[PDB]
Write a protein that binds this ligand. Structure first.
Ligand SMILES: [Zn+2]
Length: 271
């Protein structure tokens, strides 16, 4: 019995703080003897404290379509469980070699040290019986259960200062050369939502504090908008509105390349 963990392309969920990180978790169902049955089967994941409103979605058994009464998803503190019901356990027994999976998830509140890690576990047990038994509640604290590989999603912060001048407005973009040694003005895509807001406004001190932007993750693979071993990522900052009475520079003048690592001062000239 083994558990595998990955991470969804962060692009699909959003580069900024307040976005979800989604973790696909899967375990290949064992081949049970005819008279061996599950007492229980649970996917468990205690998510990193930087992730809030933690839960699981997309519960699946490969090659099958589950119904809503096949499992129960619950959160206790940071710990999410996907616990298969009696019907679900019968399905899993009938599906040897097939992947049992779910996507664990939480909302990014902030970067902190910048390395958000995750593991998941499979809590299951079987018993020989002449007659198929009713399931049992999985134990709260099993000793050393099968545990996945650890994955890591890396995040950094950004502090912008307009000079402080209140009411200046900015928008953040994905950079074309996201992993350049020297970041460039070249951008693509729509503005990035920071806690649901795509327009950033400097406060009384002329500051915008972006508490998290995605840098890279530990997953390898073609065309993932990623660089596995990267500790810094490029973004493009665009000034959209000058503070009251100030010049908003034309074209490339209002575009700033920013290097986010696991701080930026824009200088203003008055009319
Ligand atoms: Zn069912």
């Amino acid at each position: 019995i083994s558990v595998e963990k990955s991470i969804q392309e962060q692009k699909l969920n959003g580069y900024g703080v307040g976005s979800l990180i989604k973790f696909p978790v899967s375990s290949t169902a064992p081949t049970l003897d005819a008279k061996s049955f599950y007492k229980y089967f649970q996917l468990r994941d205690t998510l990193d404290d930087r992730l809030t409103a933690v839960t699981a979605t997309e519960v699946s058994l490969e090659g099958t379509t589950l119904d809503p009464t096949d499992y129960k998803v619950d959160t206790k503190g940071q710990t999410v469980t996907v616990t298969f019901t009696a019907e679900g356990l019968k399905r899993i027994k009938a599906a040897p070699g097939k992947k049992v999976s779910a996507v664990f998830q939480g909302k990014v509140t902030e970067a902190r040290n910048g390395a958000i890690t995750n593991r998941a576990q499979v809590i299951s047990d079987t018993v020989y019986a002449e007659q198929p038994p009713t399931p049992e509640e999985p134990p709260a604290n099993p000793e050393n259960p099968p545990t996945s590989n650890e994955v890591t999603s890396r995040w950094g912060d950004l502090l912008i200062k307009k000079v402080g001048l209140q009411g200046a407005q900015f928008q953040l973009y994905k950079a074309k050369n996201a992993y350049a040694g020297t970041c460039t003005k070249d951008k693509e895509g729509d503005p990035i939502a920071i806690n649901g807001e795509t327009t950033l406004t400097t406060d009384a001190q002329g500051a915008i504090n972006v508490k998290g932007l995605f840098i890279s993750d530990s997953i390898d693979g073609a065309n993932r908008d990623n660089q596995k071993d990267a500790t810094a990522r490029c973004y493009v900052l665009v000034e959209t509105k000058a503070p009251a009475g100030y010049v908003l520079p034309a074209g490339d003048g209002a575009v700033t390349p920013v290097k986010i690592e696991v701080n930026v001062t824009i200088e203003n000239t008055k009319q």
